[PDB]
Symmetry: C4
Subunit: 209 residues, 4 copies
């Protein structure tokens, strides 16, 4: 759990994210909780040129290491960590289906039982605010209160979890749910959903196993 190991996992997570087709437009950024702040990807460097040394440490005060420029979206990664103490990693991307659903400004409802992976019966959509602002950070923080992933209106996705592996897995699953919702929405509106009772059973079953 030295800095270098966490740094390699961030980079591996970026590469896997691009392999999976979630990092369309080179827009993603990934962070892990570390010491009193976080390790995040830098702005301006293509994912394929990234080395351990490029990863940027940002303390709990928001001061970043000298000589390195963190992601232009670092502020809501820090909002995530302060809003969800259990989160140890954060994945953000502009994946196409998640983003199209966020353009409609809709939340994804319970069209599939795997929706319970993010914590409840839906995937919320936080209202728009300019990227990098304190206003965007407050919407994200309120949205992650009872959910581990959220859409950002006219923007993309944020997913958090106990480690990078699980955070990537969740981000990917939300992209799948987003694609299921847009494919069926074009056929019928509204789309059939599972009841709240049904989702409460699945949630208990996921706690158990």
């Amino acid at each position: 759990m030295e800095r270098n190991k966490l740094a390699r996992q961030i980079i591996d997570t970026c590469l896997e994210m691009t392999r999976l087709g979630l990092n369309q437009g080179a827009a993603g950024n990934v962070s892990v909780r570390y010491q009193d702040g976080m390790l995040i990807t830098p702005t301006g460097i293509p994912y394929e040129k990234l080395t351990e040394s490029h990863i940027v440490f940002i303390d709990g005060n928001g001061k970043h290491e000298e000589g390195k420029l963190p992601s232009s979206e670092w502020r809501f990664h820090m909002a995530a960590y302060q809003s969800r103490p259990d989160a140890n990693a954060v994945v953000h991307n502009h994946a196409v289906h998640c983003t199209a659903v966020s353009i409609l400004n809709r939340s994804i409802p319970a069209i599939h039982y795997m929706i319970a992976a993010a914590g409840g019966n839906s995937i919320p959509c936080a209202p728009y605010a300019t990227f990098g602002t304190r206003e965007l950070s407050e919407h994200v923080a309120l949205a992650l209160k009872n959910r581990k992933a959220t859409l950002l209106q006219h923007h993309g996705l944020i997913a958090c979890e106990v480690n990078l592996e699980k955070a990537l897995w969740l981000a990917h699953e939300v992209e799948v749910l987003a694609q299921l919702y847009l494919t069926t929405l074009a056929i019928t509106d509204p789309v059939p959903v599972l009841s709240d009772e049904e989702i409460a059973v699945v949630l208990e079953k996921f706690k158990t196993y």
Copy 2:
């Protein structure tokens, strides 16, 4: 036909399933008929970390080997084997087009002559029940009575066949049919289909060759 050989084929089938784009969300599971029960993939292990030793034997009583946790969806694999004596392998996934059609709760009708690969003029959609339950297992068993593949409402797909190669092939073909049906459904409802007579000719022709 030793256990290890069947175990390698299960793992190879998972990898090919992911290559083909059918294992979106790491949700699939694969089994083969063996001795008095089956060999199935374990729960919790990413497909890329799988080794021969991870494959779990489950007997005809439903008891699994000590120290190994089988897939959380093993029960309907055992339903498949008891309902279709000719089936020797079972592929289950949450492939995006199959699953979107199952969210609409529709069966796929005869829009293409290859529909006859699963046994008749359609691909049914079994009613929803919580994953891992005996109720889900009964719907699956009734649906596979006269068909080799079925959709599961709000869930995904199950396909079975005489060996893994053919079961993967069928699962993939149903995903193609699902995508053909959703693409044309967005344009026109209902979608043009081939008549029952026409499908009976194709079925006879597939018996012959």
Copy 3:
């Protein structure tokens, strides 16, 4: 131009066809004109297990070599060669967009200037007939009279050209046109097209260069 060289190109064409995403469902078949008939892919053998020795020679009488089973769809490859003397290679697949357009039973009109690659202002759709029949062969032959590619209703695509490279290229371009037509058809009906005069200019320009 020995048989073995043509045989390797057929196999390479299958592999490239699968790489390009056009051979969904393992359904394609490829042939080249040779001697008094053709060399075609065999039925039953997965594309990745294919070797030079598997390629089947079928003479001008329709008799195939002893001990080898040609594609179940060889008959319309032979129809293509008798209907278009200039064709030296034939690619057939069940590519998803081409096939969805053939399910609607529509021809692809002039939505893009590259439509002229197949010879005119459209891509026709030949009426359905059972696969492998003489009736299907007659529709295909009439459709290829003034066009180098055609859709087959409820079925797929046939493209022909002077060599395999160009035949693959055309097949791929028709899949792109098919996808352009289904994407815009879901938004507006009918889709804007280029005039007949405009296509006549492009056709002359393609003759020139």
Copy 4:
């Protein structure tokens, strides 16, 4: 910055363009500003057979080197360079989503904040004219006046930037925006957009960082 180095980058850009799924139909062409004209890809040679020696120099008078045939679309690459003095590289392709939006003859409006990457609140669509003509070149030149990328009606996309890396990046981002617009357009018309004020803030923020 010798000719050979620029030539390798053109070729690498073609390969990456095909990897990204933007060069559907082998239709793209790439150029860089050089000396008194440009270096462009040749017509007729598949991207995978390209070598440094194939790259064609075209002077400021439009005369190309002896013995080499430049792209059939070289003329609007030269229009781009004369219309935008800051552009040093030009990427053109027939990417499927960009092209479908150009078939509708619509401009892409501000559905996402990344729209500001091409310079304003939209991605224009230049009117159709036959490929390779002086009339097409004038529409392209007028469209790139205040934008770094444009759609071409019934045709495709042109993107320009200070170097190939950035030009590819922009072309790819416009394909993502195009796909976001067609996916949401099928659900609702018109699609929600960000206001002009909001885009002016983002534009200033991109100048800053």
